[PDB]
């Protein structure tokens, strides 16, 4: 007597499939990636940089919080607290901020440089400052920015700078806007004043705009801050009859490509990932993830999903082809060293020995099929968490509708393709093992009665040697012709 | 004598498969959604705002045209027409127009306030008004808005603010006047250098007319530039003109959950609810696909180009991979009535029709959860789809239009060969589980009868119908019938 | 004896399956285009626009290296040099430049006509030119353009006005200088407190020059920016100034039926066809996908991050799921070449390659209808891909990136997983369609013939080709050959 049979384990893992669910299986593969490090980490090689809680421009016009900071000449992404506390110390607002933040999000090489320094506005008063700026306790001011009357005298200031650096360099001005006619005055003299910025392909010039306005951090005047690239060996002049906010620095800077900001407290804590996301850093094959939308680096596709279970065994019982669960009835606790085989009732003794030929040939197959549905993912480089003004709104509604669509179509292609290739895993189990039983009684044909639940009986005395033909398909029909029927 | 068949009907229903066309099936269902309400509807209980054919425009600024509008303090979306007849009566344009539209478009709470009456201008003159705005037929004016002119000789320096301790966020707006030619400048303001000032926490602004020559449009040179600010809880808004100041008198609480899009179309709301509207009718369904209309707003099927996605549930009609249907079985059974597959047997007794209550339900869940699937895994959020852009945005809709098309290929791309190989697989399913029922017998038997050619097998011996039964229902046994008549 | 066999042959063809690598096929068929003709061509019927090395905007003004460009009244796209040499020859820039851009991709229709010609500017100079545009080799200037200076030491209000009687939407380009110091302003206009009004129906905007000593740029310290409008049917443009106006001579008339794209490269236009070109030729192919370059115009297949999508069309080559192809039928017939599948016969007369067509029939029709299937559904309209931007829009570029990058991970990933899905079950097919084929006999011959093993059966009687044909064409009588040699 020989049995065809398949492997049964202890095992409660389920999978679903097209057609069926809660299907407990014998060996699977989750390909969604839950865990992340919970480690903020660098990124290649290259930390992020960390604003504490300031702003960009609270760091960039050097907001007197921002003292302690700790600038790091290159990183690979910015972190920064979803609403700084130190930012425009004092009141007003920033030209093209997002493009700004957006342009400084990756570097290569940034590095501060003098370019204006103050004690040579020698027609002017250089000690402004402001009790919204304030160092316990005294008024002070933006520590990378400059210009009142000296005197009862406002001359015209007009200074330039050519960039020798040999890097395109950052640069940052401001125009000032008083409370109301009088105070204008008593800083800057002259009434119809004027800021003149200019440099090969920038040119503009700001008036001052007064207002009547509330007071933000005790002020009623604001200052708006502009900025531009100042290309190698180009110059920049300014011109200003008052009003002029003006840098003492700029920043060289080299950029190889670009970024993002990520929104999160977490900390720089030394370790390395191809893939951040503001709750921890991904390390993983898989294809999916479902920690967080908001990533930075070279991820799997965020899935809306929260379990991809791949078969990898076969179905686990205590089918299209009809032998697995069907006219096999079981499976066999005994044999555990492949995922089909033979079991014999013999003299000598009996019975579990594991078919090596066609197991291997399955683990091969499952094999190829997992690396397929992983190996195929095209993963490039993405920041994908971007910035926009309030005037913006629209556009950032085309962004979400974006990052929605691409989110339903992964989601909605991973979860079908684990339903599809569950239910083609089941089955191709179910056939290798029908094949099995046909191999067989493709080979003995009138020398065993086919019993029902997957078992020949044999007409004569089968031995081991014997077994071990039928086992490794060498079993010769013509040396048996005992008739018992 | 048993013997193993399938059922069949007079079913046309046809189907499409990846290796065969136009196959007729016995039962199908379709999954694209085709058909809608023709009714504007309410949103998940929450009406449109309705703009009649008034602009957001006329109807902030209060154009007169705009009087019987109704205004609603909830709505979930906007229904303007493409062209609206009322806007600007006096000419002009709106700052940042589009992004205020997409601002109103879904609102909480929304609430008009009287911020600054106009009977509080004590020192400029307020009934002002223009034959653009005429309500027959006198001069009138947007009913929202004052236009402060000279009182006498003069126009002292108006100077008003508003702190806003409403509770909620608010949307207030102005204009500045751009007049024909200095005597309208003197007749209506006295002074020359003027400019208009407006400030608050985070705005900051200041505009000084521009008088030129232009076209006469409504028989107006001059026009009126508006722009809008949202006026945060507790903060306040400084006005300051020394002419040309078009003031509000007031201004909108408002509160936002989230955001929505405007509708255009000529219809109007229509007493009845959905999840999801279009702009040529409501539509109510399970599944997730539909191809009424891109324009969407709510909770939507996905739109496709297709116009057939039809599912095969039941089998191949016969009035395959396994060989079974259409194959060694040649034909089906119109008798068989109460399932899928089954037996016919030849008794002494009768015979002999016995759908096979076992494998049928097998059937009827695995392919009730295949459209369950297929279904079920389709994620629908709630989305607006339509949406504006200025003249000197081309570039960005076109950006928008790109990725509406490309997302509209794939969904269409992907639905059709889902269709396709599922269907495939059906038909194949169904033949799977006719062979395995016909070998689920012959196993049985063996010895004990004969296998004559499609699906029939002749027992060598008297089999009744209590014999019978133990063979539909698996309980059939071998010995108790050695009579071999071979 | 009769043998069921399959189809093998000379074949090295490679495809891959969900289940296995390289694997030898009998026939198949890539579905990716890779080639080009290497053309630049025109598009429907339709020539593109050719700059030359001149930009839009030195082709608009009439830079004076732009006057020999040949420009043709239609044009399907542009095709414009990464980095034209000949643009803003005086320095300065364009607002809203890649609007216009993109305004002027696609065009119906489009020609310059004169609607302010010089002389009649009696009381202005007309002449000023510059070095900084020069013709070897005295100074000159934007053709379509007029440097409006002062007579003597006068500049009156310059003032004049068009109306648009054209019949078409009119192009109308005007810019405004900012000289380099007071003393500059001065030589040239007069005056000192300027401005530069432009007004339409819809436009109305004041510049004023913003003097301020900057870098030189060709030469030149000064800069003119430009602006641009559409001037409706009938509506007329007022322009009125006090010094500093740069006033247009030429408006071009304009129509367009939809848009289009700039193509990028140094190729020029070199008379041919296509619905489909790329920066590197042009594309003719019926295929869904091609790999050939991102940036495309027309109506093109979809670009995939893949070189070689190779779907399996004949049978696994052996020099299965339903275990008879490299199964219980070991190896494959190089015998046989007028079908997919057939038999072999041992008699006393010939023997014997005889291929069943009924049963290869039905498999090349499916075939065929599962490649159509997969190329037919792909949906190709017209699009452009390659999009402009400033460089402040890089956020709205990198938006434009994201998308167009995420369009080709999702068709990658489909049609690579397409692609190995299909095979697995193409090769099943033909597994089936044997495994079918032996079993159709088997169930016709019963105990005639013995199951030897390589799906060969032994006739339990004499067999002549006849009797042979009875097999193959399934009509064969058992009742016959009741003989026994068992």
């Keep these: 007597?020989?049995?065809?049979?398949?492997?049964?384990?202890?095992?409660?893992?389920?999978?679903?499939?097209?057609?069926?669910?809660?299907?407990?299986?014998?060996?699977?593969?989750?390909?969604?990636?839950?865990?992340?490090?919970?480690?903020?980490?660098?990124?290649?090689?290259?930390?992020?940089?960390?604003?504490?809680?300031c702003?960009?421009?609270?760091?960039?016009?050097?907001?007197?919080?921002?003292?302690?900071?700790?600038?790091?000449?290159?990183?690979?992404?910015?972190?920064?607290?979803?609403?700084?506390?130190?930012?425009?110390?004092?009141?007003?607002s920033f030209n093209d901020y997002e493009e700004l933040k957006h342009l400084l999000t990756s570097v290569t090489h940034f590095e501060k440089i003098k370019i204006l320094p103050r004690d040579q506005w020698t027609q002017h008063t250089t000690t402004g400052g402001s009790r919204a700026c304030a160092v316990s306790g005294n008024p002070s001011f933006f520590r990378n920015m400059v210009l009142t009357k000296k005197g009862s005298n406002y001359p015209v200031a007009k200074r330039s700078y050519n960039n020798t650096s040999g890097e395109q360099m950052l640069i940052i001005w401001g125009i000032h806007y008083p409370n109301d006619d009088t105070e204008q005055?008593?800083?800057?003299?002259?009434?119809?004043?004027?800021?003149?910025?200019?440099?090969?392909?920038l040119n503009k010039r700001s008036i001052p705009?007064?207002?009547?306005?509330?007071?933000?951090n005790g002020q009623?005047?604001?200052?708006?801050?502009?900025?531009?690239?100042?290309?190698?060996?180009?110059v920049i002049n300014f011109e200003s009859t008052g009003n002029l906010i003006a840098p003492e620095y700029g920043f060289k800077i080299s950029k190889r490509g670009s970024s993002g900001i990520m929104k999160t407290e977490k900390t720089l804590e030394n370790c390395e990932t191809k893939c951040q996301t503001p709750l921890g850093a991904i390390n993983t094959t898989l294809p999916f993830?479902?920690?967080?939308?908001?990533?930075?680096?070279?991820?799997?596709?965020?899935?809306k999903?929260?379990?991809?279970?791949?078969?990898?065994?076969?179905?686990?019982?205590?089918?299209?082809?009809?032998?697995?669960?069907?006219?096999?009835?079981?499976?066999?606790?005994?044999?555990?060293?492949?995922?089909?085989?033979?079991?014999?009732?013999?003299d000598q003794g009996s019975g579990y020995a594991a078919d090596k030929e066609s197991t291997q040939k399955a683990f091969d197959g499952i094999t190829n099929?997992?690396?397929?549905?992983?190996?195929?993912?095209?993963?490039?480089?993405?920041?994908?968490?971007?910035?926009?003004?309030?005037?913006?709104?629209?556009?950032?509604?085309?962004?979400?509708?974006?990052?929605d669509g691409f989110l339903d179509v992964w989601t909605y292609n991973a979860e079908l393709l684990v339903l599809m290739e569950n239910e083609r895993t089941l089955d191709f189990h179910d056939s290798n093992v029908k094949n099995l039983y046909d191999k067989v009684r493709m080979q003995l044909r009138d020398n065993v009665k086919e019993l029902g639940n997957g078992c020949f009986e044999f007409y004569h005395k089968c031995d081991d040697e014997c077994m071990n033909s039928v086992k490794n398909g060498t079993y010769d029909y013509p040396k048996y012709e005992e008739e018992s029927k």
């Design 1 to 53: 007597q020989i049995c065809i049979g398949y492997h049964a384990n202890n095992s409660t893992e389920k999978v679903d499939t097209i057609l069926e669910r809660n299907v407990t299986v014998t060996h699977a593969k989750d390909i969604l990636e839950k865990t992340h490090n919970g480690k903020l980490c660098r990124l290649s090689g290259i930390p992020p940089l960390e604003l504490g809680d």
């Design 55 to 92: 702003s960009i421009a609270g760091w960039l016009l050097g907001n007197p919080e921002c003292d302690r900071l700790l600038s790091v000449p290159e990183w690979s992404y910015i972190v920064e607290k979803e609403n700084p506390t130190n930012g425009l110390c004092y009141p007003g």
């Design 185 to 201: 005055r008593t800083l800057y003299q002259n009434v119809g004043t004027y800021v003149s910025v200019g440099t090969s392909t």
């Design 209 to 216: 705009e007064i207002a009547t306005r509330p007071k933000v």
């Design 220 to 234: 009623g005047g604001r200052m708006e801050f502009s900025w531009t690239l100042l290309e190698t060996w180009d």
């Design 289 to 303: 993830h479902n920690i967080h939308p908001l990533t930075i680096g070279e991820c799997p596709k965020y899935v």
């Design 305 to 346: 999903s929260d379990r991809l279970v791949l078969a990898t065994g076969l179905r686990n019982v205590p089918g299209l082809f009809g032998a697995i669960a069907g006219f096999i009835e079981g499976g066999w606790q005994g044999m555990v060293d492949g995922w089909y085989g033979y079991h014999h009732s013999n």
């Design 369 to 403: 099929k997992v690396n397929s549905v992983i190996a195929k993912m095209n993963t490039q480089f993405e920041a994908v968490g971007k910035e926009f003004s309030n005037l913006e709104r629209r556009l950032e509604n085309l962004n979400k509708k974006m990052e």
